[PDB]
Amino acid sequence: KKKWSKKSMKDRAQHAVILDQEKYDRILKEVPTYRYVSVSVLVDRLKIGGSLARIALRHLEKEGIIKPISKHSKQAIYTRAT
Amino acid sequence: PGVSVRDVAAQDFINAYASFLQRQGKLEVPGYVDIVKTSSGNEMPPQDAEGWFYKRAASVARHIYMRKQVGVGKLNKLYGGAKSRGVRPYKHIDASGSINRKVLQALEKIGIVEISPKGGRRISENGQRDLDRIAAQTLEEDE
Amino acid sequence: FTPVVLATPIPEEVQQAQTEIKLFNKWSFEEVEVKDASLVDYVQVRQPIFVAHTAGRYANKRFRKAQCPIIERLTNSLMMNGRNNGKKLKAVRIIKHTLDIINVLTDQNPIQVVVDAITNTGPREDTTRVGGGGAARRQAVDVSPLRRVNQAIALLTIGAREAAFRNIKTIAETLAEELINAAKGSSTSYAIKKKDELERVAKSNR
Amino acid sequence: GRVRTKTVKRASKALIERYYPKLTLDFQTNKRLCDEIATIQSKRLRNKIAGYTTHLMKRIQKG
Amino acid sequence: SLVVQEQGSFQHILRLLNTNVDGNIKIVYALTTIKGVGRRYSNLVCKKADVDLHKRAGELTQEELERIVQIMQNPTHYKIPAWFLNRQNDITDGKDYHTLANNVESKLRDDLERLKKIRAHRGIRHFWGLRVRGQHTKTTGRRRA
Amino acid sequence: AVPSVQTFGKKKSATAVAHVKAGKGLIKVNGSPITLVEPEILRFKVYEPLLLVGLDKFSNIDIRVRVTGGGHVSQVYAIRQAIAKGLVAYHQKYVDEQSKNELKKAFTSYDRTLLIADSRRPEPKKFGGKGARSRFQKSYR
Amino acid sequence: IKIRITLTSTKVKQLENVSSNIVKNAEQHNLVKKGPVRLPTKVLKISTRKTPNGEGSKTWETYEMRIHKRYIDLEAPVQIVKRITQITIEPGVDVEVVVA
Amino acid sequence: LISKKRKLVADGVFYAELNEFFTRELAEEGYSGVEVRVTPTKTEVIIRATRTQDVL
Amino acid sequence: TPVTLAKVIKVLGRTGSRGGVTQVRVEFLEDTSRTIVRNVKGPVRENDILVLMESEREARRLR
RNA sequence: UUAAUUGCGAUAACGAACGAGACCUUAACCUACUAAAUAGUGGUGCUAGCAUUUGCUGGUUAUCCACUUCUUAGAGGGACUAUCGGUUUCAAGCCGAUGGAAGUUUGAGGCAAUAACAGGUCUGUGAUGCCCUUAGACGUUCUGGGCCGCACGCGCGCUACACUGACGGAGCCAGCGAGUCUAACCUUGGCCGAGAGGUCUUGGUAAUCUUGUGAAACUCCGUCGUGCUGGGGAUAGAGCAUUGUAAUUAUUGCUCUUCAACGAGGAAUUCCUAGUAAGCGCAAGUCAUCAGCUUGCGUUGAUUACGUCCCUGCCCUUUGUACACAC
């Protein structure tokens, strides 16, 4: 039969689902200088699963560097304190 | 001032109530929890598996209290919802009257609820006072 | 200002918004003067609203959509592509998130920078068809201010929409970055690139 | 669209023919006298007739 | 907010019942990726295993895993209600079984060719490749044969 | 006796009837205050009138409202129209015509909808289609 | 005595002159009553095709039967009761009374 | 005992069926139409027509 | 990109073979009293400002 | 000029009629009349909780008192383009603005002319002409299959192709409308069962009870993570109930398991200008059971025009014609 499609490949991203001390102090030193912060920011700049991203957002707004301003579900919005 | 469920919000209150009951531990959960999907349509069971019986209980207590008299039929029509019949279009479907009967009977055991004529169940005055006091606790907890 | 109390206590930020000045939830619709004396009279400001939703019967007459609040038009443009017909509530939610994103960024008025973006990406000359008979040809012509408005909002919405399709970067944040791109002039926003491409072919087939 | 038929126009013409003094420019009283002075089987039709009659009385008052 | 660094205890891959399984995922959906088992039974037996569902697979113990598969291959010992199972009241014993990665297709072929040899309608439909469940077959679904 | 009135606000199919009187500055809806409406933005949308006029006009006044019909948003628009209409009724009744007319003037200059209700009643269905205008589909071959 | 009279008809003006002579009879004899409890009117709708056969275009007709129902609760002794019953029998309209 | 809906429609089809009967059999007698008037313990059928003694 | 801001003062009428465009008289604001007659695509009205990427054209017609 | 052979008028025409319009229904407005536990409101008393301070939130048909704004229905009113400003032989009328519930014939329908098709239907009709058949009948009845059979092509529709999301929890609001009598409809309650479902009861011939149909979508929270992956659910297997004399090519439903194409659709093509499209689910019709069908109902609710005849076709007039079962 016929397909009428192309169906090519992509990067097949390898976002992390666990971490190490290197990734940990990386994000600790890297989350600043981010006037805008979000799950996708963490993902693309740190190559992490969204579960890691959400939990780390919770962790960092708990310890206090990132100042949230809106805690709506499906979208977490933070600045950093400075 | 006087306090009431209508005065306080819904979901945070229900969270607090189910947490209070989960801490009290005197609910006498059936035992087949962590098995069922709560319906014929919910394509999976819940996620806070150890919980959600207490949330269900708190919510139905709130609901009957706002209301007067209900039945498990009404509760199923309330708590069920959409089913994916595969390719075929969606449909509303009624939840597990057995689950609702069991939580109702748990509430009858603790005495928060009271079987009520003209059909159904109803909030008792002990439930009334502890409900208003939990509302006080929540509207103090937020600060 | 006086913080007034009632039998029912109210939050003080909203009491302040009442007593002081009409706003968004936060933002001030004033000091959003646009630079284009062409696009004035076909935008809508100085009619502030807290929410970006109301069912104003604007599309009954011709230019009452010009008198419509612009951000309402943005929401109404955002809800499309079928499955998201309606869902104006999630539209205004996304607006809320985007505007907060812009203002944590570009810390001037995000309302101001979005209006600067749409007037940045306004298409001014277009092309149009002549049939011929046997063969079709083009001819470049001018554009309405209202049409600039509609084309720009459509452009932004659709670029951010396809940016959000089948990827993790949500529509809110891709929309915000698209808007500031169009604001400054980026060579990265769908809207401006399509605009000057179209005006370029118009210039060509003048 | 907002055009009116010949039964309407001729009725208005006849009433202005033989009741010009008894009536005036006011839609309301023209309606409330039309109702009795000309048997009319339709309220909306009476209203249309009244409107046209005041149109024509204005014409007479200017020309 | 809980953040902790996964060390060599983690493993990107493992093996369960003639099948390689992926870490870096929710364990229950790893189980569903294994055959003969879906979300219901996977979630159920993970609860019976008394272990975190939130946690991934690679950072787990062989005692956990052998307890899990022990549940899977002797569930009725572990108090399963005897209606979750994908094979209730088997024809030869009347016992309610759960078929797994290989046994599913094995016993499938078994009862299918059984029908075929007793010359049943369903058997011959399965044989020729027609539709078995009383479908309409004229118009739709020509692209499987 | 009491200074009290009883008015409403209509919508597509949503009717929000409000009883208003002299009280202590309380607002309730189904026995629940205004802060528990829960579309989470339409809370501000329904605050709009009383914020426009300031809470000074709500100091010693009690409102209790009860609503039915149609969607959440329809209930909401019915509510804000009902309370605006009822406040204007109260100020027609007890307060001066001056306060009444300036009040409605502010409300209207914000929006005509706050007092007058959207009379766009829904169109019926016809045969030939799934709706009021959309026919089904043409086929020829 | 506590009767309830009711009418269950479609011919509106018939029903209404019936109700009018009813109520004026009741009030000239000076008997207690409630008003004419006017129920919501019920429209029986039948929606089908115009075409007897199957062909031609599709076209639907909607026939209607409009029903109006009224009732009042009354008290009156038996002689006035039965005179009221044996009077005010207007055709087309359907009537029935009950007690207790 | 039965609902007033089916009561009324049964009265309607009753009228229709007897009208069919009568426009069939009294057809050569100058028939035009008929009218039941409901009554307690009675129901009555005028036949508007021309050839009166003939239908009698 | 030196453009000229000029205002439609008259609409001549609709053109395109499909009513999709129009012809309008437009006065330049800079160098006032310098008129032009030109085309427009979108919805437009009287008194209406508009940017023009040139001054020196008057397309008579189109199909 | 009009939506209009609708009007102004022009005029070997005058006066009329049909169609349209008019008319009918429904949708919207009425704090004005008639009113009412088969609809509500408030208050009184009885009574629960918190506050207690006065109150707030509630339950209470025989606790009653009063009212009818919501609710119904009845009679009625109301908008006729009112006014104003331009435009127009300055006439019909057109545009804008104000006010107004409503200012595209207010909206949508119904009704819907003369002539005509060698349109469809003799399978709706005990309406049917003519022919055929009429007893091993083409009549009727009984059984079992059949109308679904699949190598393939076309038309309606439902599902999706995922974050404007899926799943699990919570909040969780409608309307149209149907219902048992000599039958067994709608069924509430409460008991059992994971569920389908079963159970013994209850109310209802109906604004009364089913039902406030506590519908869905939605919204708030979390799990997920861009992965033909928790998308999607055909395909199949096993088990469990129900409908029906009978379920076998599984009726339908519930549970577990198997989880395929599909990554937005090519030449082409459909519908559509306002609460309309579209999304959403809901009742009724068929009906013992079976909705992806239809008719209706409501819920959330956009963008894009206010034009043109370019394509496809329509109306009037003029013209040409070797056309008349008529390009």
mmCIF file of C-alpha atoms in Angstrom, chain C residues 17-18 20-32 43-54 58 67-72 99 109 111, chain F residues 44-45 47-49 51-52 80 106-114:
data_model
loop_
_atom_site.group_PDB
_atom_site.id
_atom_site.type_symbol
_atom_site.label_atom_id
_atom_site.label_comp_id
_atom_site.label_asym_id
_atom_site.label_seq_id
_atom_site.Cartn_x
_atom_site.Cartn_y
_atom_site.Cartn_z
ATOM 1 C CA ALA C 17 -6.480 47.479 43.397
ATOM 2 C CA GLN C 18 -10.077 48.488 44.080
ATOM 3 C CA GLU C 20 -6.447 52.878 44.055
ATOM 4 C CA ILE C 21 -6.421 52.063 40.358
ATOM 5 C CA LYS C 22 -7.731 49.623 37.777
ATOM 6 C CA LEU C 23 -5.056 47.251 36.563
ATOM 7 C CA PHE C 24 -4.523 43.729 35.477
ATOM 8 C CA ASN C 25 -4.210 41.455 38.466
ATOM 9 C CA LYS C 26 -0.904 43.382 38.699
ATOM 10 C CA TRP C 27 -0.087 45.436 35.633
ATOM 11 C CA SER C 28 -1.002 49.021 34.780
ATOM 12 C CA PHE C 29 -2.643 49.450 31.375
ATOM 13 C CA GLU C 30 -1.321 53.026 31.320
ATOM 14 C CA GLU C 31 2.109 54.054 30.000
ATOM 15 C CA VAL C 32 1.532 51.613 27.121
ATOM 16 C CA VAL C 43 -5.632 48.943 18.909
ATOM 17 C CA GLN C 44 -7.480 49.050 22.231
ATOM 18 C CA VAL C 45 -5.902 50.404 25.396
ATOM 19 C CA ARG C 46 -6.996 52.778 28.172
ATOM 20 C CA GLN C 47 -10.012 50.483 28.722
ATOM 21 C CA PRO C 48 -8.362 48.400 31.416
ATOM 22 C CA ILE C 49 -9.532 45.022 32.680
ATOM 23 C CA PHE C 50 -8.305 42.703 35.406
ATOM 24 C CA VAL C 51 -9.128 39.605 33.382
ATOM 25 C CA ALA C 52 -8.602 39.103 29.643
ATOM 26 C CA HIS C 53 -12.062 37.595 29.126
ATOM 27 C CA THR C 54 -15.534 38.871 28.374
ATOM 28 C CA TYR C 58 -17.653 42.570 18.885
ATOM 29 C CA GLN C 67 -12.778 48.465 19.764
ATOM 30 C CA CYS C 68 -12.395 45.030 21.353
ATOM 31 C CA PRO C 69 -9.686 44.819 24.048
ATOM 32 C CA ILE C 70 -6.579 43.568 22.287
ATOM 33 C CA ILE C 71 -5.586 40.916 24.812
ATOM 34 C CA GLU C 72 -9.041 39.424 24.532
ATOM 35 C CA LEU C 99 2.860 37.999 31.009
ATOM 36 C CA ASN C 109 5.625 46.788 30.896
ATOM 37 C CA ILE C 111 1.946 44.790 27.758
ATOM 38 C CA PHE F 44 -11.663 38.983 40.180
ATOM 39 C CA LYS F 45 -14.167 39.209 37.338
ATOM 40 C CA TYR F 47 -15.166 41.554 42.243
ATOM 41 C CA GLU F 48 -15.020 44.080 39.351
ATOM 42 C CA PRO F 49 -18.129 46.181 40.221
ATOM 43 C CA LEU F 51 -13.906 47.279 43.236
ATOM 44 C CA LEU F 52 -14.934 49.882 40.659
ATOM 45 C CA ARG F 80 -22.267 40.035 38.963
ATOM 46 C CA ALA F 106 -19.788 54.007 36.280
ATOM 47 C CA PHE F 107 -21.037 50.451 35.797
ATOM 48 C CA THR F 108 -22.173 51.157 32.227
ATOM 49 C CA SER F 109 -19.066 53.103 31.227
ATOM 50 C CA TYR F 110 -17.181 49.995 32.281
ATOM 51 C CA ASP F 111 -19.616 47.675 30.506
ATOM 52 C CA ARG F 112 -23.257 47.608 29.460
ATOM 53 C CA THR F 113 -23.365 43.954 30.509
ATOM 54 C CA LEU F 114 -23.238 44.739 34.229
#
